[PDB]
Amino acid sequence: SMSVKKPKRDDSKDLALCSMILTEMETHEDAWPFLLPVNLKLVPGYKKVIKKPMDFSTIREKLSSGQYPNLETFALDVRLVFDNCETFNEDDSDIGRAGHNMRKYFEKKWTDTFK
C-alpha cells in the first residue's frame, strides 16, 4: 500500500532474456506455422474467427520497440499465438501438433528463466 512495498525484484535483464527465449522459439524446427502473420486474404474464416491474431514476427517487432510494459504482457502474446492455433487447427494435424510442441517448449524456458 502507500509507503509499504515488497522487496524490489531485479527486472533489468527481462528485456534481454525475453529476446533470447523468442530467438529460441524462432529457430525451433516446428516454428514455421507461427513465423509470420496468417494471411487474412487467403485463409477463409481466420479474420472473423480469430479476434486477436498474433505471430512471432509481430511479437519481435513489439519487443524491439518497447511495446511490452513488463515480462507478463510478453508471455500473454506468446500464449495467444498457441491459443489461436488451437482455436483454428485440429489437434491431429501438422499445425495442431506444432502448436502443442511449441507451447511446451515455451513454458519450460519460461519457468527455467524466471521461476
CB 35 within 8 A of CB 56: yes
CB 21 within 8 A of CB 101: no
* Rounded Cα distance, 19 and 26, in Å: 10
CATH architecture of 1-115: Up-down Bundle (1.20)
* Rounded Cα distance, 47 and 68, in Å: 24
Record the cell numbers describing residue 90, joined without a space. Answer: 485440429
CB 59 within 8 A of CB 76: no
Residues in the chain: 115
Identity of the residue numbered 52: K
